[model samples]
Target: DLKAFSKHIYNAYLKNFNMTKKKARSILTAPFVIHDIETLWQAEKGLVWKQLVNGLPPYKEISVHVFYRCQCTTVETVRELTEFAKSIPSFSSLFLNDQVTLLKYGVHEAIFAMLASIVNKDGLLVANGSGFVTREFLRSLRKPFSDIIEPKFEFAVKFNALELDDSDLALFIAAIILCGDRPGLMNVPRVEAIQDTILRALEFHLQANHPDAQYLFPKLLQKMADLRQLVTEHAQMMQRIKKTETETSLHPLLQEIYKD
Candidate 1:
């Protein structure tokens, strides 16, 4: 039954996202030091800030460090997303290459979508909900690096207004990963079928969970379209960094994800 399917997805979400909505709500609302290199050094034992024996000046160093942190969190989220996708019977049934294709194309969208759970207009949780990094601080970083993250914050802040909980996100993220429109999908019909079911489940869940909320399902679909444009702009900025900021090393995994 679809009820059983929804429950299974809910469990997968609780298992994978590391910080659930319940935990994020508690942690993000508490007072925590707004993170910068000095604060991160003390809070995370300096481990989160990789040692650059002779590093760039303060601005450049902070920007690079932020990029590193973003990469680390993104990679971790991708791992969680992969496991979540695998938990779906249809997703796991896709050919191995198809699975990789879906993840490669879908992960950034999924990551940015889920990021709203840990984000607020003022700041976002970092280091697995252990630290809060303020939007103002990120904006203080150098031009292009600052440019890269602000849009995501803008997107996250707006997306947060949708008021989706972890259970709702479970099915929505599955729909994103199983999208039929991704380029190079070998089995479009199969993937589309899976996405359709997830979308159906999402509609059904929202109807029951948000009885008074009208147009939630279609609104979510529009958000998905917005996410696509956000990611496209993000990739353009990443490409600029790759060409211009040679000193900043993008993680290999991220490179693979961003590569054309």
Candidate 2:
């Protein structure tokens, strides 16, 4: 009964987004490269050379380029997720502030979960499949910079092995965004009720979707816990970056979301 409503919302999510893993993999993985300053300079037509000559933009702009490009990906992902959240029946019914709060707290967790759809153990595809950033390359960044996303890649690879398709992911992401456990929720009872329905629906879906695979549901439940931990580390990393990196700036929306 309760689950039927969740099922309806889940189907609505699928209908609204309709993204396959291959589609997500290709789209999310945009083509962009990261390289050393000297190496980037050798390209001759790009950013750093002009900066090397003028101490300004159109030249020494590669770091800014990579940072903003990656941040743009984060912005785009959040935008799509916001739309997805709006489309879910239960999520849409919540008070508007509640919706914002849910998204503010949950989007990062939701982001990493969906990211698993396109990630693997060795690396993640970026820039619309035009670029591949290996694990080593990412970790090579300066302190606090590399820390922000590494755990997500680590978690996503393990999460992907569970092989939840878009249908399953829609439900799971909705559940994360509707969570009542997040701090400062305006309507705890309603949110909790919604989360319950989602959990039940998720269990039912997993049974049919992965019928032969035992413990899949419980394992997913554990991953939800793991997701929470990952986001905690994410927030901590963001805090360090904000405090320590004067030259580097975080995007405004990102600052708002991770405000300390």
Candidate 3:
């Protein structure tokens, strides 16, 4: 794009990567904020974080994408933030070295935006319940809030967690993305943990009636329910992904203490 075009976009909003209280308040109060909520809930890694997160080999697809970030960032943080993305890399080679090695810089940024915030900004919800999706993901620190000293309980998200083979998980993500509405985690009813809050959000949107929303709402609802249930029901089943020494060092344990 031309410099004028770039300036036009940069000037459109305050341009912060993280969400702020003001942004959250704006989103929460906005009639369309659920739409924004669906977007942000997908996970925090934005235009700069997602593409480069794991540091895979550059590939043609990566060549088409790029991201930019400041000095203070990490792959785990981005992964935590981009919670709702279809993260399974699709390549014959292990670890998606083939897919990511292609990236440059700008394209990765766009991809993070595409994966995170684009749906919130340029998209619409149709046949919405209240409505929209468990939905999508994000990558920015543009949102701002001042820290205050208030007593609050130390909290952690709880729910079922599993590790599936890369291929199986990829199939799952494809199935959901094919729904054209984002699908993500949600808290199961009355469950005392991270309830995969994203799923409930998806169900809410699937039943919605927003006109410009994805037209496949009914089918999407049905399929998403079936597939999401598959993941949730297996709360006790480890997803069986191969572990690397690096991964073991990074993620030392499962999310919560299992009762069994």
| Candidate number achieving the greatest TM-score relative to the actual structure | 1
User: What shift in Å separates residue 25 of candidate 2 from its native position after superposition?
Assistant: 5.9
lDDT (Cα, tens digit) per residue for candidate 2, span 1-260? 75676667666666655345767665554434434545334333342221232422242244444555567667667887888888776788888999999999998888888878767666766545545556666666666666676788879888988878776887788888888998889999999998888888888888988889889888988988999999898888778767866666667889899875
lDDT of each: 0.84, 0.73, 0.25
lDDT of 3: 0.25
Off by over 4 Å in 3: 1-215, 226-239, 242-247, 253-260
TM-score of each: 0.92, 0.83, 0.21
Q: Per-residue alpha-carbon lDDT of model 1 for 76-99, expressed as tens digits? A: 789999999898788899999999
Worst 10 residues of 1 by lDDT: 49-58
Off by over 4 Å in 1: 35-37, 44-60
Segments in model 2 whose C-alpha atoms lie over 4 Å from true places: 1-7, 11-19, 24-65
lDDT of 1: 0.84
| Sort by TM-score, top down from the best | 1, 2, 3
TM-score of 3: 0.21
